[PDB]
Each structure stands twice: as structure tokens, then as C-alpha cells.
Amino acid sequence: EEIRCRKYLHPSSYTKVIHECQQRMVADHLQFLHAECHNIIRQEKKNDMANMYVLLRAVSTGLPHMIQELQNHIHDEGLRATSNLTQENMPTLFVESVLEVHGKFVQLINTVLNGDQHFMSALDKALTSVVNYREPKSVCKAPELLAKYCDNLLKKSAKGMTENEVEDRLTSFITVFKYIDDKDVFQKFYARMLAKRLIHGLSMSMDSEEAMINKLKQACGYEFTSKLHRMYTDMSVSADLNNKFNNFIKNQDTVIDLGISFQIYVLQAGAWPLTQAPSSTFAIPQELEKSVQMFELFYSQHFSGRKLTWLHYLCTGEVKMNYLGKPYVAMVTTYQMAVLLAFNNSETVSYKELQDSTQMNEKELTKTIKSLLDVKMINHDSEKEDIDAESSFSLNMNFSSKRTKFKITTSMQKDTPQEMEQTRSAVDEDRKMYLQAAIVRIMKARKVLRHNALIQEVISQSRARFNPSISMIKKCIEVLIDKQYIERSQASADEYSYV
Amino acid sequence: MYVKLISSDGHEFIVKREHALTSGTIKAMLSGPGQFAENETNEVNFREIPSHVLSKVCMYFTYKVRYTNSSTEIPEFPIAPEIALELLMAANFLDC
Amino acid sequence: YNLIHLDPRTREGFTLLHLAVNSNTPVDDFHTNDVCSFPNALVTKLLLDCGAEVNAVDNEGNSALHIIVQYNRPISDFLTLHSIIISLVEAGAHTDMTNKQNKTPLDKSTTGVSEILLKTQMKMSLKCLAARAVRANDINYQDQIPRTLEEFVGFH
Amino acid sequence: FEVKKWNAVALWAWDIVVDNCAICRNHIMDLCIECQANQASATSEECTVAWGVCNHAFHFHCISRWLKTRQVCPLDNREWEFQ
Amino acid sequence: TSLKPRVVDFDETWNKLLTTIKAVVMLEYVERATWNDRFSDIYALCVAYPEPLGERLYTETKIFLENHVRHLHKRVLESEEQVLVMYHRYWEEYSKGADYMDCLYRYLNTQFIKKNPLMEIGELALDMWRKLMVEPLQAILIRM
Ligand SMILES: [Zn+2]
Ligand SMILES: [Zn+2]
Ligand SMILES: [Zn+2]
């Protein structure tokens, strides 16, 4: 008909005729096409799908049903390809499944459906729905899985994970990362495991970590990768700072031979999540108190206005066990530096002999003691192996180390599952405070709002980092009620008035 | 219809309506929820433009509305060295 | 849009708009001269539609306006010329822009028709007077005016 | 006993806790936006923190270029004196 | 102050501007002092030292407008048979609001949008009205 009206009609009638060729042939049978449209998408018949698209595009109200059907098909395919995974390499398989679904449907839309941006938006919505697929009355697992995927691929291991493929795998990972919609959880988890990967030297490549930081920056603005970039820069600058301290000590008038090698990793307290919750008054030994006080003097002299907060649960060392006739060398953790110093003077010690040498809570003492009882540096003098009031301890003379470099902190590099829920609670309270601030700002600014509208206003500003639930923001409202920030209006409970 | 331009120093600079509507943003300020069609004050407040610059801006308003249709070698607008680079930001903030 | 966004520049600085508004753009001896002639109002309007840099400056300092005002057939093709000028004025072409010799497009008119067309297409523009005062008095306008006002002063 | 070598980690924070240079909006310990480009020329040591009497902190390049034309502290409009 | 490019935190000025902006789209009352101060706020945002926050302002006002027409859509769609009168009331408010915001976003419209496929604020609010109010309700509105 386009050819026929080309060689039989005036130019002004080229379009109208074909319009009447459509409204009587494709529009009038929309109910026939749309009812078949669902069956076109599920079996993925590209030959029929392209013709259905180029037909329904002319009709005013034909495209949106096809868009909705494609979105539903993509969502169902994503659930089928992602919901059957069970552990093993689940963080990698989830990302690979979402990447494969996205890659299949992008080329399906581009090659077949003209590369239409409406179907691209439908694909984006379907992938947002499948990525954030959480079990009913449960917690979403997508940010944890993606963060574990990054941690698994970016760690140093001899599994053949070459460098020349990571920097292009991460560009593909950004595609699934853009659909998280819960980016606060991923940011916190990636910050924690980035701290673990950088402190212990588990990062396979510093430049690859910096590539991660820049990719997340390009994905979610600068403020997303603020703490992460400060972490990376601190770890990069720490070597130069150690080199500076290497000649600061020789530049003093009196050559103070400390007797130890110093490899301080000085870090920003406002970026790293390393928080010492209890008091835990560490009794620094005589071989380290001079070093720590002289380093404190160094910052009090060189980097003015920089308060130091020494935490001892990320630092390690090596102590010469000369009482056992040198059975190789061992790498050990700092909290039991006290535990083993009292054994230097007296062979047999107890809780009374160790309380005056440690001076902190019993929770730290019990776990640090069990860290040595199980690995058999310290044996129990009496039969009562369980923790009691006296609990006499002795150094194991008979036991000898076998491995040349004996490491007791393997337990250290294991992201225990129990701390995962602690980080989840930390994220929960962080977003609770963020929503508190958001409601205070909006309520102070506007001075009048409705119950159904205040939630929408809060979502409008809180969409940047996470998805606020309607039930949990309801609980947030009573928190402002308790803090006399808001109360229900006298005329109706729907309205709110600032006080 | 006789609007009042107030500078950052409180200097009232009452000028005619069609004179002050040459600048786009003064028209925008008088439009919207700034009309008050009561012909009482038509007050616009310039918290930033200094008086020695708003005076030159009002003189420009009069000079433009007088010489907008001449095209016969209109006299040059006298801009002092010190008024320039501060009259420029005023002529930007008050478009044209 | 993509073509201008990759910024194609002739060896003399003549961007696509400058070549579209120039009668000196060569046309080959084939049937093109019977259809495609320059300057073209439709080609200029199409270029201005697709985000062309209207105030683009070549090596001599000229812009699209400085080139179109020099049109040598200002009556027989007047409408086309007329249209082009208003198109430039409808796309933010600055009528006070000075080239490397400090010649406003009125000083480069070489024609009464283009001169009066551009005169009728201006505005009084106290911004232009202030920028001319800043340029003539050699006042250091660095970081003391908005970012756009720096290139605005650079125009004059 | 005796220690052959000791690994240590310590967190530092300013006594006056301030987060980001309000001029460039980047963090103070991060590179300024002017020096965030052309990293070959920069040695990652010129972007020193520049404090002031007003208890505000900026990148040295940011506040140095801001004081090139003006003489006022960016956030709190008072005279700027380096501390 | 003065018209020189100062540095302004975008959150503070945008929260100051949104109280006025939200009262303009729905035709509430705003004082001459506030309405005239918002022009200086927009000028300071579009000129802000060292890089202009014009694109940030446009993105945030686009986000607000799409988060405002969605609310009006949810309020109009929930009306079973009064959707015509609710749509007419909201359109009578929103057309004047869009015109007044085009007036108030004069510097953003001229010095930024025209200087650059971006859309003017008066054009953006109307184009977003059809995309988020009329197109979803196209099958419904005409049906009655
Ligand atoms: Zn800075
Ligand atoms: Zn720098
Ligand atoms: Zn200050």
C-alpha cells in the first residue's frame, strides 16, 4: 500500500491512506494481536516479535501492552535463572546470571525491536525487580552477594585469576550493580571487606582496587566512594609515611634503637569502620610503650592537630619464643602480647597474676586466652579445663611448632557470619538516622504535611541511597513523636504540625 | 506602573514600568506571585546589586527605551572604569 | 548532532556553520550547483537545530554572523540572507562579537542590506556595553565574574 | 621476651572535626578537583590541608585560588588568615 | 552580599528554594521577599564557585517535578468518577505553576539551557505533565 499510494496519489495523501490502512487492519484487531502478544514474547520468536513491534508501533495504544509483556517475561526469566542457585559460588553465579539475562535481552531489543528505549526501560525495571527479589518478610541479599563477588574476584589467590581480565569484568559488573537500589548496604559491606582486603594485604592489585573505586564513583557520584577512596589513599600513602618515619628516627639527636621494625598503617578515623566499642585498656608492654609514645610525639611534632586513637585488634607482630629452644617463628596478634609477657617472668600464672598485667574486661580475656589454649601454647595446670575463678595456666614446654611460619590468626581473615548481622544492624540504624534527619528537614521546611504525602516526600530525598519501606518509615514517625518533634493534628490524624 | 527598585543599600530607585520591563528578570520578579495588581508599590528588592550600580542600571533603562529605535549613531553609554566589572554582573542578573 | 558534537573544523577554523553560511564554499561543476547552493537558509536552520556551536570562532576571529553579513547578493537572494541572519539571532549569535581585528559584524557588513538587517536584529544589551567597557579598559575579569561572563567578555 | 618486629595500626582524626573542602566539595584528604586531573604533574603531596583562623579547612590549592581575587573566608564571611 | 560567584552548598539553598517551589506549582502564597530572594538563590546556584551548579539544579528540579506529578497522578487516579474534575483542578494549578516556575527559573533557562538537547523549565514541567499525568491516564481520561 505504501508502494501503491506512491504511484497513484498526491504527496499530501501519502500518510493518511496508510493511516486508514492501519486503523482498519492492525488497530481494529488489537485485541487479537495483544492476546497473542503474550505468547509471542514467552517463546521468544524473533521473526514474529519484530513484525509485532513494527505493527503495534503505528497504533497509538498498542505498544504499552507489548512493553509490559516483555518486562514480565524478562522478570520471570531472571527469577528462573537466579532463584535456583544454592551456595557454592553463589555471589559469582548471581552476578553472572543477571549479566547473561541483561546481555541476552539488550541484543534482543537492539537487533529485533529497533533498539527502542521504551523496551530498554522495561528491561531496566525487570532487572531492578529481579535483583531486589527478597523472600517475603525477609531481607534482600543482592548487595551482600555483589559485595562478596567483588571481594572474591579482587582477592589475591593462585586460582588463575589473571589481571588482564578483571578490569573488563568489572565494567560488566557495573551493569548489575546499577540495579541494586539498596546501595547503602553494598557500600557498607564493600567498605568493611575493603578494609579487610587492604589491612591484611589480600588485595591482588592496588590499581585494580583503584579501578573499582573509580567505577563506583562514576556509577553513584563522588559521595558514594568517599570513605572507600580515603581508605585506598590511606593505604597508598602509608608506605611513604613509613619511609618518612624511617628517617625521622635517625634525625633525632640521640639514636634511639627501638629494637623492632615499624610498619605503621595510619588511617583516617572518619572513613574506616574500625570502631573500638569497649574500653579495653591495653597494657602496652615495655618493648612497645616507648615506640608508641615516641610515635605519638612524632605526630604531636609533625602532623599538628591530629589526635591518635590506637586500636590494637588489627595489628600483629612476631615475638621471639626463646624459652622453647627456637621452634621456628610465629606471627601473632597484639591482644595477647600481655598474655605472653607474664609467662616470661613466671612459668605458671593465673587470673590473679594476669588481671594486673592486662586491665580490661573479662570478655576480651576469655577469648584471647582461648585463642592460645586451643592452639596449645598455653596448657591448663589443673583438670578444670573450663573457665573458672582461678584457672591456673602454664606454658607448654613439650609442645613444639612444626610449620616454619606458624600463624595463629587464620581465624582473623575469616569474615565470621555473626558480624554480618552486626553490620546489617549498623546499616539499619544509619538509615534510621538518615530518615530522622530527612523528616526533620522536610517537616521544619514545609510546616504542614499529610500522612500519605510525608512518606512520599521522604522517599523523594531518600531514593539516592536505598529504598525506604512504608512500614519502617511508619515506625520512624513515632520516633519523632517521642522526641516531641511531631504530633498528630487535632482536627485530623492525617495532618502534622511542627512543635 | 511606577515600579520601585530597591538596592542593597536601601536606595529606592523608582522608575517607570515599561522602563524596568526591558530587563528580563525584573519582568520575571514582577510576574508570577509577585504581581499584586493593586498599583500600590510594585516593590522589587535587590539584596546584591549595589546602589552605585543600580543607579547606572536605571539610567541604562531610560537610555535604552529612549534610543531603542534611533540607529543613527546613538551616544555611547558612559560606563566608568569602576562601575564596569560590577555593572556586568548586574546586566547579567538583570538580563538585557 | 553527533557530527558537530565531535567538532569538525576546517584548516582555516571554518566550522560546519561557517561553511553553511558562506557563499565562498565551493560547489563542484556537476548538477549540485543547480540544486545545492550556498549560503543556504534551510541548511543553516538544520545545523542550528542539531546543537551547532553558533558562536564558533575561526582563526581569523570571524563567526557565522561575520561571514553571512559579507554576502555579495543581498537583494536577489535577500530572503535567504534575511532568514539566515534571524536564524543566527534565534540561536544566540552575538551581534557585538569582535573578530581578531576587533571588527563587529556591522563593521564587516560591506552591504547596506546586511547592515540594516543586523541592526534591526540586535538588542541594546547593557551586558554588551559593560563587556565593551571591561575589554577597552583592560580590567582583569578573571574569577570575579560568572564563568559564562568570562567568554562573554572574550566575545567583545 | 623480645619482639623482632611489630606491625601497628592507628586511626587519626582532627581535633576540630571537619569533613570536606567546601569550595571544591571534595574531601580535604582527597585531591582537589583542580589537582584531581593531570596526576602526572602532581606528586600527590602538594594538596596539603590549609587551615585558618575561622577553624575551617580547605585544600591549599582551593583556598589559594579563592584568595587570589577575594580576601574572605568562603563559608563564614570574615577575613581569612592562615593558621 | 554581591553578585560575584561565591560558593554555596547546594543542599541548603535547594532546601530553601524547594519550600518556595513547592508553594508555586500548587499556587500557594509566597511573600515578595521570598519570591525575590529565590531569584538571587537561583543566580548564586547557576554561578556558584568554582564550578556552576546549574546542571545539579536542573537535575534536582526535574527530580522534584517528576516526584510531584506522580503524587498528583496517585491523587487523581484514586478518584473513581471524579478523575475529570480532580485532573482539571490539578491542571489549572499546575499550568500556572509551570508558567511561574519558568518565570522564576529565568537564569537557568537563558544562561544555561539555551547556552547548551536540554529542556526549558516551562517546557520541562509541561512535557513531564503529559509523560506522567496524561499518557498514563490517556486510556482513562478520554474514556469518560
Ligand atoms: Zn578543595
Ligand atoms: Zn591540588
Ligand atoms: Zn571561616
Numbering used by the authors:
A (entry chain A): 246 to 744
B (entry chain E): 17 to 112
C (entry chain D): 472 to 627
D (entry chain I): 22 to 104
E (entry chain C): 1 to 116, 135 to 162
Original authors' sentences:
We recently discovered that FEM1B, a substrate receptor of Cullin 2-RING ligase (CRL2), recognizes C-degrons containing a C-terminal proline. By solving several cryo-EM structures of CRL2FEM1B bound to different C-degrons, we elucidate the dimeric assembly of the complex. Furthermore, we reveal distinct dimerization states of unmodified and neddylated CRL2FEM1B to uncover the NEDD8-mediated activation mechanism of CRL2FEM1B. Our research also indicates that, FEM1B utilizes a bipartite mechanism to recognize both the C-terminal proline and an upstream aromatic residue within the substrate.
An excess of the CCDC89 C-degron peptide was added to obtain the cryo-EM sample of the CRL2FEM1B-CCDC89 complex. Following data acquisition and processing, our results indicate the presence of two distinct dimerization states for the particles. One state exhibits a symmetrical configuration, while the other adopts an asymmetrical conformation. The cryo-EM structures of the symmetric and asymmetric dimers of the CRL2FEM1B heteropentamer (FEM1B-EB-EC-CUL2-RBX1) were solved at resolutions of 3.39 Å and 3.37 Å, respectively. Hereafter, the symmetric dimer is referred to as dimers, and the asymmetric dimer is designated as dimera. In the dimers, the protomer-protomer interface is symmetric. Two head-to-tail juxtaposed CUL2-RBX1 dimers wrap around the FEM1B homodimer interface to stabilize the architecture. The overall architectures of the two CRL2FEM1B protomers in the dimers are almost identical, as evidenced by a root-mean-square deviation (RMSD) of 1.66 Å over 1600 main chain Cα atoms. Unexpectedly, in one CRL2FEM1B protomer (CRL2.p2), the WHB domain of CUL2.p2 (WHB.p2) does not directly contact RBX1.p2; instead, both CUL2.p2 and RBX1.p2 interact with the N-terminal region of CUL2 from the other protomer (CUL2.p1), thereby forming the CUL2.p2-CUL2.p1-RBX1.p1 interprotomer interaction. Val7, Tyr49, and Pro50 of CUL2.p1 makes hydrophobic interactions with Ile44, Arg86, and Trp87 of RBX1.p2; an additional cation-π interaction is found between RBX1.p2 Arg91 and CUL2.p1 Tyr49; and CUL2.p2 loosely associates with CUL2.p1 via electrostatic interactions.
